Amino acid sequence: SMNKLYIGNLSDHAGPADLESVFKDAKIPVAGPFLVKTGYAFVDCPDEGWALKAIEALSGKMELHGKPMEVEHSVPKRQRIRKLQIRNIPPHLQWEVLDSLLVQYGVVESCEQVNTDSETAVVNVTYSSKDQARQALDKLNGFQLENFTLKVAYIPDETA
RNA sequence: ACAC
Description:
The protein is of the alpha+beta class. It folds into 2 domains: 1-74, no CATH class; 75-160, no CATH class. The chain is 25% helix and 31% strand. The chain is built from 4 helices and 12 strands. The protein has helices spanning 16-25, 48-58, 95-102, 130-140, and strands spanning 4-8, 35-36, 40-44, 63-64, 67-68, 70-73, 83-89, 108-114, 121-127, 144-145, 148-149, 151-154. Strands 2-3-1-6 form a 4-stranded antiparallel β-sheet, with helices on one face. β10 (144-145) and β11 form a beta hairpin. The longest helix has 11 residues, at 48-58. The two termini are 16 Å apart. This is Insulin-like growth factor 2 mRNA-binding protein 3.
């Protein structure tokens, strides 16, 4: 599943207790313990929705020991193959418009909506190949559509 | 330096 979070840009002395306080104060449930390394940690959310909520509400915003947090879907390096998530999609944008951008970098085998409580839309994309997803990520992360900057990232590709 |  897509419930595991990566938490990056952490203080030298950030520990599980701090992260437990951050999620409590942001009222984001977590499904298990926090595993703190050096500058980054991992934690599981009960479902994909809460994981996405944690990303939207904490990433780049939440400061901790003066350092702001990065929160992303945790994706093992080996599983960065064909699948992306695109966030901050203009709310009522027709899928023909989004798709016309996606096809410019490869064959899109699947394109699915992630229903979110923000105004913007979120979709999960599967391209034919690793090379195509990499290109689509390079050219679509940061692309300005209407007035929204698209946010593109890997999600686990567990079938390759 | 997304865990080794």
